[PDB]
Write a protein that holds these residues in place. Structure first.
Motif, PDB file in Angstrom:
ATOM      1  N   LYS A  52       2.878   1.866  -3.503  1.00 52.33           N
ATOM      2  CA  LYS A  52       2.034   2.372  -4.468  1.00 52.33           C
ATOM      3  C   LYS A  52       1.802   3.589  -4.172  1.00 52.33           C
ATOM      4  O   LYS A  52       1.696   4.448  -5.366  1.00 52.33           O
ATOM      5  CB  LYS A  52       1.026   1.105  -4.705  1.00 52.33           C
ATOM      6  CG  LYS A  52       0.658   0.240  -5.670  1.00 52.33           C
ATOM      7  CD  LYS A  52      -0.725  -0.517  -5.606  1.00 52.33           C
ATOM      8  CE  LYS A  52      -1.623   0.364  -5.661  1.00 52.33           C
ATOM      9  NZ  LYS A  52      -2.957  -0.402  -5.373  1.00 52.33           N
ATOM     10  N   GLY A  53       1.185   3.886  -3.073  1.00 44.30           N
ATOM     11  CA  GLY A  53       0.683   5.353  -2.805  1.00 44.30           C
ATOM     12  C   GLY A  53       1.615   6.232  -3.126  1.00 44.30           C
ATOM     13  O   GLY A  53       1.501   7.333  -3.440  1.00 44.30           O
ATOM     14  N   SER A  54       2.880   6.103  -2.612  1.00 42.27           N
ATOM     15  CA  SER A  54       4.170   6.938  -2.835  1.00 42.27           C
ATOM     16  C   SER A  54       4.613   7.212  -4.357  1.00 42.27           C
ATOM     17  O   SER A  54       5.129   8.484  -4.729  1.00 42.27           O
ATOM     18  CB  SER A  54       5.231   6.616  -2.111  1.00 42.27           C
ATOM     19  OG  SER A  54       4.904   6.365  -0.636  1.00 42.27           O
ATOM     20  N   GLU A  99       0.937  -0.953  -0.147  1.00 42.66           N
ATOM     21  CA  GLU A  99       0.057  -0.019   0.130  1.00 42.66           C
ATOM     22  C   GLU A  99       0.967   1.192   0.097  1.00 42.66           C
ATOM     23  O   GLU A  99       0.817   2.067  -0.861  1.00 42.66           O
ATOM     24  CB  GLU A  99      -0.960   0.072   1.162  1.00 42.66           C
ATOM     25  CG  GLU A  99      -1.660  -1.230   1.294  1.00 42.66           C
ATOM     26  CD  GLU A  99      -2.910  -1.198   0.720  1.00 42.66           C
ATOM     27  OE1 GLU A  99      -3.872  -1.876   0.724  1.00 42.66           O
ATOM     28  OE2 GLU A  99      -3.121  -0.550  -0.320  1.00 42.66           O
ATOM     29  N   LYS A 100       1.794   1.390   0.934  1.00 41.41           N
ATOM     30  CA  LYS A 100       2.655   2.370   0.990  1.00 41.41           C
ATOM     31  C   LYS A 100       3.545   2.612   0.019  1.00 41.41           C
ATOM     32  O   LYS A 100       3.426   3.937  -0.612  1.00 41.41           O
ATOM     33  CB  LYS A 100       3.902   1.935   2.346  1.00 41.41           C
ATOM     34  CG  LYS A 100       5.195   2.509   2.018  1.00 41.41           C
ATOM     35  CD  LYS A 100       6.234   1.733   2.715  1.00 41.41           C
ATOM     36  CE  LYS A 100       7.613   2.199   2.555  1.00 41.41           C
ATOM     37  NZ  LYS A 100       8.626   1.208   2.944  1.00 41.41           N
ATOM     38  N   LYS A 137       2.529   6.353  -7.303  1.00 42.52           N
ATOM     39  CA  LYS A 137       1.293   6.462  -8.208  1.00 42.52           C
ATOM     40  C   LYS A 137       1.303   7.820  -8.722  1.00 42.52           C
ATOM     41  O   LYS A 137       1.229   8.733  -7.922  1.00 42.52           O
ATOM     42  CB  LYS A 137       0.157   5.957  -7.685  1.00 42.52           C
ATOM     43  CG  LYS A 137      -1.281   6.052  -8.337  1.00 42.52           C
ATOM     44  CD  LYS A 137      -2.382   5.641  -7.550  1.00 42.52           C
ATOM     45  CE  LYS A 137      -3.619   5.385  -8.583  1.00 42.52           C
ATOM     46  NZ  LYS A 137      -3.655   4.139  -9.407  1.00 42.52           N
ATOM     47  N   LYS A 148      -0.877  10.891  -9.894  1.00 40.11           N
ATOM     48  CA  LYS A 148      -2.068  11.434  -9.782  1.00 40.11           C
ATOM     49  C   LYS A 148      -2.170  12.779 -10.205  1.00 40.11           C
ATOM     50  O   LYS A 148      -1.301  13.404 -10.550  1.00 40.11           O
ATOM     51  CB  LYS A 148      -2.406  11.405  -8.029  1.00 40.11           C
ATOM     52  CG  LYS A 148      -1.914  10.305  -7.263  1.00 40.11           C
ATOM     53  CD  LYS A 148      -2.418  10.571  -5.770  1.00 40.11           C
ATOM     54  CE  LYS A 148      -1.019  11.384  -5.244  1.00 40.11           C
ATOM     55  NZ  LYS A 148      -1.042  11.644  -3.852  1.00 40.11           N
TER      56      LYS A 148
END
Ligand SMILES: [K+]
Lengths: 304, 304, 304
Positions: free
Chosen positions: B242-244, B239-240, B246, B248
């Motif tokens: 991907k979030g960092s 999660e961490k 990705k 957007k």
């Protein structure tokens, strides 16, 4: 010719006609200019069983003639388990296409299909009992490379008992003249006796041999087939067999014959034979395209 | 050019030649009139491993040129378990076709094939080490959208350690001038050091960055790649990551760069970036067709 | 017409236009001369679910028009498990091709696709809720064989509750005049009531019948559909059902109607009905090609 179901359906003359037509197709290919002979015509590949090899060659042949191809390769569950019987599929597809190449496990499958088909049926194995096109390309190879088919001395090596394509070729050659046949195989895998009877009746000069060394250098064509593992479950004994019948370079050097193999080649022939002059199985493969071209063309034109 | 095995085989000039040819193919496509450049020519798709993407693009490219295509996608058991070795299949198929696109897991597979092939070999991944065509279309995209390749500031985001296509692109760009490179990735997935050495040697100005925010708006091209789950078995940590990394919308708004992604896009880029002007990966996809057209055409014509 | 998503999107007049166009395609086929109407155009077959039937017909239709076809049949794991969402695949493929035939399980799948597609979308089942082309060919068959669609007496036999293609046909016919409908089925599988409401509202004369014998010889068209086994797990009872609704020769002899069946035919119709004059389902199958030809052509030309 309405269909091409089995070699049993055509005589020497008609075979030679098909071969002449193939020689013409080969020249056309040599031209490297786009051929339009079958432009606007559709070939339907209908296989209940798999055969990437069969499909590719016919598909190439049809496309070389400027034609189109639709493909139907899985029917073990795509319509055999989907409900539709063979005769239904044939009818639907003969409505879509102009000609069909069929490979179906059931005996007399191709024959039945031709009965319900409004378009020519080509039998590519049912399920691998009669493969006329393979046998035609084999014969073509012999004519091209040897000059003519009559008067050749041909030796077959491998499993002569379950070699369907050997069986088919052997029969076809019996229609020709002065053909001497040599049958080399393990004692366990000798040519089916009934065939032997057919040869004796046709008064063909033939020999059953145990070893490759029992062959003299008078043979014009060496046609090698597969000896599957299912014939010798014991890896130990299977070593023995393979070793005894595998074609090797040292045995090939200085030989008169050409080597034919329907392919794929697995164990039957050493890789360092490939580059020897007598190795012709890959050229044989190519010849498969011009004769399938002739076959396709002939069946279309004979029926319209 | 006899074959297209690896980017390592061609220089800047030859790359630019191929790109010019691609620009021509693109115009031809824009014409919406039937092209006959490769009419009568057959492309053989030979994949031991699957790649619906690769197959479609090349098949489209060949058909846009008025050519034909035969397909052979499963060889994990269709001939690898059927016995036939690679070199045999190549020989049979180079006899059928005029050119081959090959995707084979084994290292140096495509190179060996080119040795036994009488027709041009195009390497579409072996098993995904060198993909020249992907790298060529990437470069094409840059030329088309940026004007030229020299003097660009490009940033790569994602798994830089296992990104084969990043690796290939990075090398190819090192052949160009004034190219500044930015390598954004998790510390665990930094660009392979040996490559770093190659860049240092070629005296390329480059930076290893930890975050997307460490990038200024001087970057001309943002090339994003995948960070697979196999890299972080713990869903929590993944999660961490991907979030960092990705991409957007809010981060993209008002940016100078175009965004490139070899596809498929899974998690790397938010869907509401698609409609932003800088999003170019789908256009990039299209460009893949004209450059594969040029490649196909060039290899045919260079060899006959 | 930008897309063909559902019969709900087109009126009688536009249906008749498409039918006229189909009659023209049929003549063209009767010509046996190569057609070039869609030469240089590419059809992309995009199926997340399998449909050898659908694919073949459209592929034949496109090739009869001199067009090309690329195929993508497995997406249950080729990109659905490979990550790529539907809208991504559509965008990539609408960049490659000129038109798409889509079969996707999710509701409103085809509609969404048309939203993200730069090329015309043809809905071949989502996952089999609305199949416009099947319904168009059914209507075509009626026009060809009966003369016109208005004023026919048509009976439907089989599973009227889950017969999606019956549902679609029934609705389409409600747009025509003086159409009398007869709904023959097991009490357990009667036409969905909501539909019954639609018919009542449109003031269509219709009857729900229990048996085939309840039909007089005023019916012009007998449209038979499948009654799957999943409807009667008890082989014993299923015997009963099949027996009661299976069309047999003796029941067909001397009848006025033609028999239509979307195919495949499994149990619904005896084989010795095939050769009766009223049997038309195989001709119906053929008609599928000319109407798909018209559909393909129309969508290309309406959008460029
Ligand atoms: K074609």
């Amino acid at each position: 010719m309405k269909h091409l179901i089995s070699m049993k359906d055509i005589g020497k003359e008609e075979i030679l006609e098909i071969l002449d037509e193939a020689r013409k197709m080969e020249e056309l290919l040599n031209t490297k200019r786009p051929l339009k002979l079958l432009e606007g015509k559709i070939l339907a590949t209908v296989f209940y069983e798999p055969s990437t090899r069969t499909r590719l060659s016919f598909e190439t042949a049809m496309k070389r003639l400027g034609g189109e191809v639709i493909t139907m390769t899985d029917l073990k569950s795509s319509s055999v388990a989907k409900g539709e019987s063979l005769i239904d599929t044939i009818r639907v597809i003969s409505g879509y296409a102009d000609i069909i190449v069929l490979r179906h496990p059931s005996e007399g499958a191709a024959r039945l299909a031709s009965e319900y088909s409004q378009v020519p049926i080509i039998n590519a194995g049912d399920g691998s009992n009669q493969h006329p096109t393979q046998t035609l390309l084999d014969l073509y190879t012999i004519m091209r490379e040897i000059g003519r088919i009559d008067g050749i001395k041909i030796a077959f090596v491998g499993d002569l008992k379950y070699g369907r394509t050997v069986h088919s070729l052997v029969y076809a050659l019996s229609l020709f003249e002065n053909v001497e046949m040599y049958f080399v195989s393990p004692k366990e895998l000798r040519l089916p006796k009934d065939i032997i009877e057919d040869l004796k009746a046709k008064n063909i000069k033939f020999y059953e041999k145990e070893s490759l060394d029992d062959l003299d250098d008078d043979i014009d064509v060496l046609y090698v087939t597969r000896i599957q593992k299912e014939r010798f479950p014991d890896p130990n004994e299977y070593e023995k067999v393979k070793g005894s019948y595998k074609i090797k370079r040292e045995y090939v050097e200085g030989k008169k014959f050409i080597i034919m193999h329907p392919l794929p080649r697995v164990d039957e022939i050493d890789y360092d034979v490939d580059d020897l002059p007598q190795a012709k199985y890959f050229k044989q493969s190519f010849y498969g395209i011009p004769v399938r071209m002739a076959i396709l063309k002939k069946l279309i034109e004979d029926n319209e």
